[PDB]
């Protein structure tokens, strides 16, 4: 027998998506004039992003002339100028990989070293950005592993910690941790050994934070754990010397059909356990791997949307129930993506205050959509701080993350991917998406049908 909170989550681990879609709906819709609103800083900020350099007012204004332009125009007297037109098999392929993993990864990792992320967190910082740093690496396979990943995360807590000199954690630097990097072969790990392997270094890691008062967030990662993860979770949040303090963070992935109930459980914890958590709202970084793993299994469903748009409206929904709790959560909205900025902006309401809620990007991914919304209402920016999440490691620690970038980037779906697109205009690009599902729904007979080239496992 499970709480009320927890068998509710149990049950709506794979429902149908047109009923999963359809109670989302109504908890998703923006009134009227947020949705006015919000469309027209979605479209603001999308504009900018766009035409950072003039891109599109370039596009306004083949190739063989401009060569000759060129050229005319380096003639340089203009009298000259007017006158003249007048008158190996196995290991190669593995070094190509590795190399070209290297080569787009650099982009999204801030320092080899975690003093090295540190020295270069300043620009940003005083412009009111802040940080949470990830010591890459997960799915540790051996004892060895899982040793070498908790003292890097030790090694990290006392350089983060010494460098936030006691900023506390809202203001100052944070570290994200995953739990499969602290026990062998997580994967697929009982309830008994977890607790008596991972649960002691978890514990560890979080009194060593609460020590420098730096947030500790605890990444999501594949569906199959979160069950454990907040056994884990709520077992952390009733120890006697982590009473009163509120920086315990932890991830939810809107792309499960769980999330709103996983909500409600935060929301019960917070209060039995009397503290406010951080909770960061993403939509998920494992979906190609989730549909796969899924379509394997051959069970009744899956536990996530299989439209992107879904995806979106439940994220909607979440940050409304976790703004609605200001006491109890404070919310982290990761995304790049500017309409969902926009929503949460405006969703959050009048007279913002710092501690209210923030929002979180990426390192090389959210850096241009941010420099909008973090810094001084006089620089024409929104005012609202921004926790870049900062991936930390060398070549060797980088190839999972890496992979799950280029999928995020290279999804025809994304909106870091459909803002590059010259041809998709901005309007399309920021629709809101509770009417995009009404407008499926208007289409196709139902609300909620799943994606028409993702059949159901069994089919
Ligand atoms: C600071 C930060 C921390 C994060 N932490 C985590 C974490 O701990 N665990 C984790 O899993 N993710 C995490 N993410 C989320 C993930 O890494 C992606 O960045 C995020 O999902 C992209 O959302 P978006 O709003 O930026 O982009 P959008 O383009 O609006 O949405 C992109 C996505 O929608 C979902 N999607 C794509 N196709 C479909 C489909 N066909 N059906 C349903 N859904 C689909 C996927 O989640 C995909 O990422 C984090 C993101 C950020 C910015
Ligand atoms: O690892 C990932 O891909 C996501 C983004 C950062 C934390 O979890």
Redesign the pocket.
Same mark, same amino acid.
């Given at each position: 027998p499970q709480s009320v909170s927890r068998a509710a989550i149990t049950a709506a681990y794979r429902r149908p998506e047109t009923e999963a879609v359809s109670m989302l709906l109504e908890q998703a819709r923006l009134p009227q004039p947020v949705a006015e609103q919000a469309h027209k800083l979605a479209y603001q900020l999308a504009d900018k992003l766009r035409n950072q350099k003039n891109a599109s007012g370039r596009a306004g204004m083949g190739v063989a002339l401009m060569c000759l332009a060129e050229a005319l125009l380096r003639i340089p007297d203009k009298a000259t100028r007017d006158a003249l037109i007048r008158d190996s098999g196995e290991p190669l392929i593995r070094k190509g990989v590795d190399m070209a993993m290297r080569l787009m990864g650099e982009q999204f990792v801030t320092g080899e070293t975690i003093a090295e992320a540190l020295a270069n967190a300043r620009k940003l910082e005083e412009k009111g950005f802040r940080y949470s740093y990830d010591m890459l690496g997960e799915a540790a396979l051996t004892a060895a592993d899982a040793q070498a990943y908790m003292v890097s995360y030790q090694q990290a807590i006392h350089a983060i910690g010494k460098a936030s000199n006691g900023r506390g954690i809202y203001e100052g630097p944070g570290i994200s941790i995953k739990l499969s990097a602290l026990h062998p072969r997580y994967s697929r790990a009982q309830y008994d050994r977890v607790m008596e392997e991972l649960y002691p270094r978890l514990k560890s890691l979080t009194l060593l934070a609460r020590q420098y008062d730096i947030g500790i967030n605890i990444? *999501?990662?594949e569906s199959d754990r979160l069950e454990i993860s907040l056994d884990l979770l709520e077992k952390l949040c009733f120890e006697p010397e982590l009473a009163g303090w509120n920086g315990i963070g932890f991830?939810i992935?809107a792309?499960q059909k769980r999330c709103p109930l996983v909500i409600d459980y935060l929301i019960d914890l917070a209060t039995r356990s009397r503290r406010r958590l951080m909770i960061?709202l993403? !939509? @998920? *970084?494992?979906?190609d791997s989730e549909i796969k793993r899924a379509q394997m299994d051959g069970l009744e469903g899956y536990p996530?949307?299989?439209? !992107?748009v879904?995806?979106?409206v439940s994220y909607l929904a979440c940050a409304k129930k976790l703004l609605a709790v200001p006491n109890l959560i404070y919310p982290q909205f *990761?995304?790049?993506?500017a309409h969902?900025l926009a929503a949460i902006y405006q969703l959050a309401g009048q007279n913002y205050y710092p501690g209210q809620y923030e929002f979180?990007?990426?390192h090389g991914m @959210?850096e241009p959509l941010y420099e909008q919304v973090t810094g001084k209402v006089a620089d024409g920016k929104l005012n609202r701080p921004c926790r870049i999440?900062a991936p930390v490691g060398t070549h060797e620690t980088l190839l999972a993350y890496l992979v799950?970038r280029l999928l995020?980037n290279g999804?025809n779906?994304?909106?870091?991917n459909r803002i590059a697109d010259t041809s998709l205009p901005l309007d399309e690009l920021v629709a809101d998406p509770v009417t995009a599902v009404e407008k499926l729904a208007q289409q196709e007979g139902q609300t909620g049908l799943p994606?028409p080239k993702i059949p159901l496992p069994r089919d």
């Open positions: 990444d *999501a990662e991830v992935q792309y960061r993403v !939509k @998920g *970084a494992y979906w996530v949307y299989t439209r !992107k879904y995806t979106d *990761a995304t790049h993506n969902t979180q990007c990426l @959210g999440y799950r995020e999804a779906t994304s909106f870091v994606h």
